[model samples]
Structure formats: C-alpha cells, structure tokens
Target: RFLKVKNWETEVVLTDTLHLKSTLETGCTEYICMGSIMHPSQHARRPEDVATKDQLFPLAKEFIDQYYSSIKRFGSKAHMERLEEVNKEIDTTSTYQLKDTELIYGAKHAWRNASRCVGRIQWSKLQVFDARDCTTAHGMFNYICNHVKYATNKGNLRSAITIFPQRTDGKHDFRVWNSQLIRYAGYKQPDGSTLGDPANVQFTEICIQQGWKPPRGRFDVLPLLLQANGNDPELFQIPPELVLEVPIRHPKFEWFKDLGLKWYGLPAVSNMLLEIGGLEFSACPFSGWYMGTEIGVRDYCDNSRYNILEEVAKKMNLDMRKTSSLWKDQALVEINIAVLYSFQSDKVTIVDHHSATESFIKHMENEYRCRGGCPADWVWIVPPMSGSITPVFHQEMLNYRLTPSFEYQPDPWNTHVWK
Candidate 1:
C-alpha cells in the first residue's frame, strides 16, 4: 500500500487530505480549496481552537517573511535574526507578539490571497484598526461602532478591519455574536413561517437566552453580544444613527416596498477569526461592500432563509406548475435587479452579478500578472444567479491553500467558557 502527501505548510501537513483524483493530477496551494468540487457557501473548514508548534512555525514564518521582505528591499533587515534570537531566548512554550507593520501587511496580503473573495482589487486598500489592546466588552463595542462608521463611510464603502486582542491560555476574552454587526432578527411564527429573515433564528434564540428583550417585530436589529474576560455576555445596541439600511423597492413598481424589505448597507462580519503567523485574533471584524447576490439570492430566496421565491413569483404572476416555466429563475433575476436598483438609488455601493463576475475575472488576470498564478474557488467567483450568462461561467479555475488567510472560527458562545 502506498500513500502520498499532496500539500503542506512550512513544517507539516496542515491537515490530512484524500483525493480520489491523486492518480489523475496534483496541485497545491496554501489557501483553502473550494468551488467546482467544493462550494464556498455550503462548505467551511473546521476551526482549530488551539495551535501546536508545527502549525505555529510556518504560520509565523509567513508573516515574518512578508514584513522582512519589504524592509530588506529598502536595504535593512531584522526579522530572521530577531526570530532566531526569540526562538533561543523565549520559553519554548511562549508565543511572541507581531509588530504593528507585520500585522497590517499580513492583513492586506491575507485579503489579497482570499480565494473566495471577488473584491481582491481593494485588498491592498484595507484600513486596519488595531484594537488588540482592548480588553473589555465595552471597549470592543466602542471599537465596533467606530469600525462600522468608518467602513460604511456614508455608503461610499471602504474595506476595513478592527482587530481585538489574541487568544491565550483560554482567556484574554471578548467576542461578537452577530454574523455581521448589522442584521435583522428572524422570528419563527407558530404557523410554520418566518416573520423576518429566517437565517438568524438560531442566533435570535441564543440572544434571548443570554438576556436580550427579543423585540416582537421581524425587522428588529439584534444587539451585539459582547463578552469581556469570559463573563456573561452583555447586549450593546448599535446606535441607530450609525446603521444605514436601504429599503427595497422595484424600479418599475412601488408595491414592492409594501413587503417591508430592507437590508443593511454594510456587511461587517464580526465573528470570524484572523490568523496571522500562529496567533488567532478571535475578535477581528472585517467589512466589504455588498456583492448583491449575497442578499438578493441566498438570504432572501433560500428555503432556510427568508424564502421569498414564492412571494416574488406570485407577485410576478408566473406559472407555478412546471419546471420549464423557470419561474424561480425569473423571480431571482427581478429580486437581484431590485437589490441593485435599491442600493444604487440609495447611493450605496453594490456590485451586480454580471459586474461582479467580470471583476472577478479581471482580478484573476491581475493576480496572474503579479503572482505567477491565481488560485480561485469557481463556485464563489461566479455569482449565484445567471451563471451561464456571465463570462466566468465558462472559464476553468484552479484552487490551492494559501497562508495568511481569513478563516472560519467556532462561535464563542458555544465554547461554554462564556457565562
């Protein structure tokens, strides 16, 4: 019997892998692999709550080289020598702090190597807010409010990240429970339907358990679940003035507004972890402009979400009986159109499906020009609706794992460390 290792980090196989296609061909990358074979929306890598030396060394080295290279080109160098000194001096059990410049650049490059993001062109323009010094839940909330304001930027939209302190010895604690800083509540009705967005039903229940009042309306924006030093979670409401929401309306019909549809202007995902070197920044929240389908296609149309396809199809008076009618497709297109129209009318930045796909292709070429190869997840690069109509639909893609990447992390509430 024979087994072959396909891909790895600086020192070890980051995770075990099995490919039935091993006899076919092999390719490797440091970034997570998805699309064609793996779907980004449905697939997520399991997170590591703790790190070992094998994982630490390579992750650390990636940041060291990124920072070290920029300075060496300018005729100065310090990383390698410093790293060796630290290795020798610090206790083998201790982890070191990454300098400000290292963290900033690591963030930018991590975004740059993000396989699932179609907005890589703006990766270099990310504004990093270093809130790593913040040690309290209130402090985290303050930074979050500021992060939301700066990222929303009156709807002009800027990529921004606010990073809280790192994880250590199961402490240095703080966490944000929302998928995004601004999201509406999902209330399950007794009649087997949802009042608002169904995607957040689980979280909504959790918040109520954690002491939130649980507003009666479906549109109520849930307060932030902030925990300080592993204590009970406290609810901090985002100032109403800071959140910008665009009410949904069809360009041709005004009745669409009667449905009471609206979505936030920003998607500031606050729960994901940012791993730079071997350390995990559990409180790093990042935001980018909307890609349209994220809200229009999945959030509104998915069976588990708001599930508005039937409503939209009924509104359009499409025949519901047959697959050939493609009523769902028609409804989806109009919904997407409404999303784009609404955001555009609100003067908020949003990329449409066609434009998003085109831009992803352009981003690929730009990366290919600079980085020798571009690794991408075809499922994510291609927008959800109108797949065949877009130019990227026919294009072939390759994916590989890349270091210095944004990754999914377990929710803090589930860890049982929080009160």
Candidate 2:
C-alpha cells in the first residue's frame, strides 16, 4: 500500500496510474530569484525513490528500533521513554512532520552520519536555515543567497544547512540545478579543451541555452535555476560579495601567485537529500570549510578537472623525466600545503588532512559512547592526500545505514532536475 500527503497551502496531485503533475502556484511566482543550480552528484550514481509506504515503513520500524536501542545504550530511561512516545506519535500519525528543534538536531546528526564527510566534529555547530514554506524558485534563490552570505560569515566560515521545500508524493518540489551554490564556469571550446572548470561544463551549457550570458573566464559564477512546481525554471545570480574565495599562493614560492589559482571559500553541496524521520527534504544544501585535501587533491588536481599537479611540478621544476622521481607526490604535497596556507592567510576557515582525519577518530569515539556506535565509512573517513599515514586510515569502521543522514542523490540534471 502507498500513502501520499500534500499540504493545504499547495495544490499538487499525482495519480499513480497516469502519474501526471499540475502547475504549482507560488507567492513569488513572487519570491524566487538568484544565482544558480546545484548537484551533489552521482555523475556515476542515481538513486530511485524509496518513498513508498512499503519502502518507508520498514525503514521507519528499523529506525524506531535503533533510536530506542541507541538511547538505551546511553542508559537513560527518561530519553528512552521520550523516544517511546515519539514512536507512538509515529504509529498514530500517518503524516510525519519533524518538529523544528528535532529537525535541527536531526540534520546535525545526519552530517555526522554522512559517509563521505571527514569534518563531522563541527556537525554540532551546523546552522540550520529552514525554508520549508518557500513557494517559488526565485524566492528560494534569495534565501540561498542569504544562506551563503551568513554561513560564509565574512571569512570566519560556519558550517550550515538550508532546508528547502520538502518533497511529497506526486507534488511539486523545489530543486537547485547547480551542483554547488558557487562554482567556476566551464566553456567547451572549438579546439576541444575546456576553458574553465570542466566539472561545470554540462551545467554551463544548460545555463547558456536557458538564456544566461556566458562569460569568457575560467572562474565565472553560474546563475541559479529555480523551478516552482516544475515550471520552465527561473534563473538568478548569486551576489558576488556573498561568495567568499581564496587565492592560491605558496609560502616560499612567489611565482605561484601568477598561476591565478583560487577556490570558493565554502562548499555548499545542494543536491543531497536530507531525510529526517521518514520525511525527505529534497532541497537541503549544506557546507563546511575545506579540508584542504578535498580541493587540493581532487577538485584542482583531478585528472579530468583542473589537472594542476603537472603545472605545479613544472613551476617548481621538479624532475619529470623518470617515473621513480616521485614528482607527482612531491608536487601534490606542496599543493595541499599551499591550499592550507592560502586559506589561513586570507583568514578563511580550512582544515588540513592530518587534522581532519584526527578529528574524525575523536568524533567516532564520542559517538560510540553516546550513540552505541557511529555509522562510519573508512573509505570515506580516510584522507585523500595521505591515506596510509593518517590514524583513520588504519581504523576498521562500518557504516550502519543509519537514518537522518544526508545521502548522495542521483544527478538531478539528467537534462532535468526532477523526474
């Protein structure tokens, strides 16, 4: 059996046999306006909906069971009984609505449970921006802008999450089309080499086709895509000042500054779904400061992306003639160091791989004492730069498929953000 709940203020109906959709009305046919779309990505993976009652109820049952088990492990009857009441609320009410305080708390826990994140220690400090009542894509853009501005915190970056309009069966839902709130532009050129950040090439093409102006730079900020009730979609720009960034520079190498390398101050990944209780928030975007390696080792150094390792090696004049030279390793370490130094020099927040990995172990130990055990992914918890050297690299951990976690969703833009 399946159940669907549509709120009173929104008119969205879905018939299973036909699976049709209706236009969503909004105060910001009146509110939506902003910078661009976002995606957490499975350029390689896409997930199917598990929102059906048959699909959700069993998961709910398991979650409720685990909730009590975890609370009991803490040896607290007061909280355990409190959870018992929540379980009753779950059984009595077919419609699930997460209370504000609980929702905020749930999201923080989700971050701690996220399989790929190494910065869970800051999860408790996550600032939650609730925008569940937002009605238009343009309006949602405005809210996203405010989130970036506030969370960017003028260089003292704060870990933050924004809950957009939640998803309901066959109903209209809000979605950000950009992979991140702020990113560099990628333009495919006639010669075949991409002109900017190759990661954004696909989205940049869509932006141009959708009436956005194309820029002639490697670091153009793309516009936002706001779709209310699945309308044609609205485009908006994130204010420049709202986006914080760091310029790459080496501590001893002054020539490195001429490379014109830089990265966004914060990473606000937008495509991941935040599932709390059994309800899913489809447009939740969250961010934490760089772990240095995340940007230095992957974003800028990935073979298909920035491909800056050779450039750095060349700049440093590392011996590239022999495979045994360890030139790649030598260059990569310097790049990672440069990223950390740059962020700190700018007074922007960042974490080094060594420190980030150490913190994850501490977070796990704390979770073990408080929540029985933390659901962890050793593959993800290990830092990319120096896997075998970090303390977490040796730790054997398991991910417990726990709920109230942020999950990597399928590529929202398979040409269209939502099916």
Candidate 3:
C-alpha cells in the first residue's frame, strides 16, 4: 500500500482507487455513484483535499501563473518572485498561503468554474470577505452574522463569500454544517410527512439533537451549525433582522398571499468546499441573489420538497382532474409569477428565468470566445419548469470540472470519525 496523508497542510500531519465512469459516458443524465444517493440532486467529484508536497507545488505554481496572467503580469519580475517565494514555502512547509488578492481572484474564478451555476454572468462581481484567521466557533458565528448583514444588504442582495480557515488536518478542519446558510427547518411528523423543507429533515434532527427547539412551522428558519477546528458543532441563531424574507404575492391574485408563503432573501450556500492551488477551504460560505424559478419551480413544486403545486393549482381554480387542462403547468407559471412579483414588490433583488437564461447565454458566448468552452450541466442550467421555452434548452452543453472551483463535501455529521 502507498503512503497517504490524511489532511497534510502547510504544517504536515499524516494519512479511493475507485474508477467510475462519468454520467456523460454512461449516457444517463443523472449520475449515481457509490455515495451519490446522499446527494440525489447533483454530483461533484471528491477532490484530493490533502495534497502531497509534489502535488501541492505544481498546482500552486499553476495557480500563481493563472493569477499573474489574469492581471496581465505573467512572467514579470514580481510574478516570478512570488512564484519563487511560493516554491520556497512549499519546499519547507509543504503548502503555501494564498495572498489576499489571490484569494479574491480564486473565489471569483471558482464561481466562474462552477459548472452547475446559472448565475455565472455576475462571476466577477463577488464580494470576498477574508475570514481565514477565524479560530473559534464563536468567531465563525460573528463572521457569518457580518456576512449575512452585508450580503443581505437590506434585500439589495450583494453576492458575497466569507472564507474561514483552510483545512489543517482531517482532525481540525473548519466546516459549516448547514447545506445553505439560511434554509427552512424540516420536522418529520408522526403522520409520515414532513412539516418544513423535507430536504433538511435530517439536518433539522441533528440541530434538535444539538439543543435547537423547533417551532415546527412550515417556514421556520433553521439555526446555523458551525464546526470550528473540527470540534463539536455549536448552533447560532441568525438574528431575525439580518435575514430578509419576502412574502409571496401575485400581482393579479390577492389570494396568493393567503397561502402564507415566504422565502429568505439570501441564497447563501454554506457547505461547499472551495479549492484553489491545491488548498481546500472547508468552510467558505457564499451568497448570491435568487433566480425566481429556483424558489418557485424547484423549492415549491418538487414533489419530494414542499409539494405545493396541487395546493396552488386548486387555489387558482384550475381543473386538476385532467392532464389536458395543464393545471400543473398553469400553477407553475403562476407560482413563478408570484415569486418574481413578490421579490419586486418587496424591493429585494431577484432574476426571472427568462432574464437569467438570457444573461447566461451572453456569458456563455463570452466564455467560449475567451476560453474555448464553458462548463455547464444542462440538467441544472435549464430551468426546472420551462424546457424548450428557454434558449439554453436548445444548446448542447458540456459538463466538466475545473480548478479553483466549489466541490461538495461530505456532510460533517457523516464524516465525524474523530469524534
């Protein structure tokens, strides 16, 4: 057996020959690998988070070169000197620190490399908050509060990322346990149904086990679970004022507001691991404004989730008895309309699927012209409701992983072996 480091960092420590065909090769739109069931919605390659000295050096060199190239300073004396410094650091410590500017660029570029994201059009407009100095769970909560308030921006919704300390060893990685920074709680009722977002039922249970008192409401905002230095996680309630929520209301139908539907303004995904130059940030929570279809079509209509389409269709007085009536389709359109209108009326930032797709197409063209191809997951880029109705639906896109990217990490609870 070959020697393997568990989480080798700048300060060394010490730790899958599994060949799987890509979904592209399998001709199956959905990928189902060994642990894919846990993430039924999407699949991302598990990166070699702990890189060996040889592995770290080349990636660091390549990333530095890319950074210099981005600033049009490739091969300059400053760039060369920086590269030499990185080489010297890695030779001695086995990993090098990313400069503040490099961290910003890496985060932005990671957004650009995000294959499943449809909002890459605003890739460069990211607000990066460097919180890698954070050492405790309390500090993590403080940084998260600051991130939420700044990014929430009273519903203006600026795109932002707050990065915590990078992984040191498998035993001491900082991690945010919530899949998204602000998500609704889910409670499995005795009647064999879920009360809130079904996707979070397990997470909600974990929160309750950690002493969170669930209100059992359909839209109860779940508390943040912060794991600092891989210790037992602590729960922090997001201040209600910091979380901007919009009440869903349709323009023409006043009854839509009667549904008591509302969603948080910020769509901050918290659990994704950000990898740059062979370094992995296990707790880099990022946020962007929502696209209407994400909340209306996927969050509300998906059968396994809220499953509100039937309720919404009934309210619209659509004939649900016949598929010929297209009641589901009508309800989908109306719910989406309500989402867009609600955000608009609430003065919160949001994008409709039509406009979002249009901008993505423009971004795709720009990427192709500059980088030959843009990575996209058609299963994701195409809005969940309207298929051929959108221009992106007609385009044959390729999906591939790129460096300086966001990759899904295993749930902290599932991987809490040290504990």
Candidate 4:
C-alpha cells in the first residue's frame, strides 16, 4: 500500500521549491549547503559525514507524529485534572516535616553551645534534665547572611544548608533555644572544645587553630575572652572539673584580677547571653523559612537544569536548536509530576514506587540523549521512535502526568522543511 520512493521523491521536490523561495525572500547571498544528509547515529561521526537533509527531515517528521500521538493518548484535559487531584493528595499527606528527634539531633550537632550542654530538670538542680532547656536547641543559623558567608568561605556550607527548618515556629524556637544554651553555657565559644589555657595561649592563636582570622578592633578582646572562657577556665580559677572542654573558653582569671570581672560582671554576662538566645530562637521561625526556600530554589534550579540545558543546546543543529529550552521546561514539569506521583491511593503494588520513580528519571535522561535533537551520526536514526514515543506517552498516561522527562522532542523534519 505504501509508495515509498514516490512519496519520498515528491516530498523532495516540494522541499527544494520551498527552500528556493525561502532563500530568495531572505536575500541569501550564498548557498554554502549547510547541514548534512545522513541518518542520525547514537555513536560518533563528523557533521560533514552525516546525511543532514534526509536524516533531519524524517527524524523530525517521526518526532512530531509521536509527540501528537502522546498528546492524544494522555494530554487530555481529564488527564491533567487527575494529575491535579493526585498533587493535592501529596500536598496533604506525603509531605515530610522534620521530626522532633531529628530536629533535636541536628540542633545539638549544629550549634556550638548546644553540643555539650545537656538538658537539666531544674534551674536549681543544674545537673537535672529540664524540658524548657531541651526545647532550646542550636546550630549555625543557615539562612543568616553572616553565618552562611562564613560557612561558604570555609566550604562547610553543606553542613549548614541541609538542616533547614520545616515550620516557621520551629526555626524561631530553635534559634531562641540555641541562644539560651549559648547564654546558659556562658559567653564562650558555642563548641566547648577549643578553649586553650588563657595563661599559656593567645586568643589569636586559638582563632588561627579554628581557621579564622584574628579578631580586629575592640572585638579583639572578645576572642581572647571566648578562648579563656571556652578553653582555659583553670586560668580563671574556675575548677578544671567544673569547666566543660569546648571550642570556646573564657579569658584567664589573671586578665580580670585587677577589676575582679568574674566577681562583679559574670552574672550580667550570663543574663545577656540568655536574653540573646531567647531573641534568636523566638524570631527564628518567621525569618528562617523565607530565607531557606529562596536559597533552596535558586540552587536546585541553577545548578541542575540550567547547566544541563546549555550542554544540550551545544549539540543540536538548526533543526534541534530548541532542544535546550525544551529540556529545561520538561525538567520543571517533571518536578511537579514527581510531587503528584507521591500520592497514589492504590493499596498494593508489586513494584517499588521509589525505584520506579528513579528508573523513570534515568530513562528520560537516556531519551534526552536520543531524540534530544542532536545525533552523533546518521546510523543512530535506525532505532525507530522508541525514545520519543515512550517518554511522552508515559508522562501523559501516568495518574500524575508528571514524568521525569523534558518537553516533547521537536520535529526536525518540519524545521528542515520550513528552512
């Protein structure tokens, strides 16, 4: 039934005429004969060696047809509606929050003061576990500009960003708790391990050990005080047994011997620390989420999709120049789909959903390598429309139409013809 050569020759004649018209309209000065006339290959080959016209024409035709077929099968309004329903379910249930245990653990390790400061039952019984104190926890405030900058420069940013707060209240409460712990633990370093002997070690020496610049201006004394309080309490005449070995230590007792600062000023310092801790924790919840979300979105979008798109665009020809944009758009679409897919109500399934999801992503990446519009050689076109049709159809047919794949592959044939 198919008149293969007849159809092919007729299309070729039509294409030549159109090409001539386009060239005239555009005032083309020279016909350099750009592009190839070879079938696309999955393997390597030079652009000159490939059959540009035939390869691109048929490949584009097939891609467009497959794209339309997928839409017909799964791109219906009802399909989108169903996808929305699943998305709503996921938004309601499967979304995870930082659990209390997880939060406490993260806080303890993240904040310097909170690391060794255990919860006590009563202020009077300082050794006992206190619930209120337990509520206050600490770590570096990841969203805080100063702290983030510090962490980033040190290459410890990963330890800071991943431990984001889930709820607004949680963030504020945690900071307040951290502040309180810092205060309660005293004006020393948050981590109690780095305090050196104030009598034997200089404040700048300790800071250098921690990979930080020496303190400047009036605040210079602050590091000395911190080191003394955090590391060398014995120099201050605080019993070595009573002092917690942490990253920060109070200054030596000798430094304040003339003014007797500990006798007259210690209580004020302790009170100030507690107040600061309270303020930090209380305000943390409101500001933390806004900052955290902004950072998360920026990193995820820029680092992952943007770079990938650039690479893809470099490989595609005139018939495939739009590949970059399509891939980027599709990645976002898939993120939405992934959110919805998390909410399937089916009771039992033979396959693991998580594995299925990962596999789906991997498969789409492979398809991107294929119909992605940039074939390394002409021989690559023989694989039929396997990559093109599968990804599109799967995205459409799924309960949540969010597939890991990017947008529909462009029709290389139509583009070449139009040219």
Top-scoring candidate (TM-score): 3
Instruction: Report RMSD (Å) for each prediction in the order shown.
Output: 7.0, 13.3, 9.4, 28.1
lDDT of 3: 0.84
Instruction: Estimate every model's Cα lDDT from 0 to 1.
Output: 0.73, 0.71, 0.84, 0.23
lDDT digits (tens) for residues 1-419 of candidate 4: 11111112123111111111110011112564212322222221112222333332332232223333444645566544444543453345422222243233323222211101111001111111112222212222212323223222322112222222221222122221111111111123456422221221333443344353533321122221111101111111122222111111113222112321111011101101111101111122110111111111221234521122233223322134465546555443332222222211211111222333334434333433432211111122111112233222233110100110111111211222111
lDDT of 4 at 255: 18
Model 2 TM-score on a 0 to 1 scale? 0.80
Model 2 residue runs over 4 Å out of place are 1-94, 415-419
Off by over 4 Å in 3: 1-50
Assess candidate 1 and give its TM-score to the true structure. Answer: 0.85
**105, model 3: CA deviation in Å?**
0.8
3 against 4, candidate with superior TM-score: 3
How does candidate 1 score on lDDT? Answer: 0.73
How much does candidate 4 score in TM-score?
0.16
Q: Which ranges in model 1 have alpha carbons more than 4 Å from their true place?
A: 1-58, 70-76, 84-93
TM-score, per-candidate, Cα-based? 0.85, 0.80, 0.88, 0.16
Indicate the worst ten consecutive residues by lDDT in candidate 3.
Answer: 15-24
What tens-digit string does per-residue lDDT give for candidate 3 at 177-239? 999999999999998988999999999999999999999999999999999998989999999
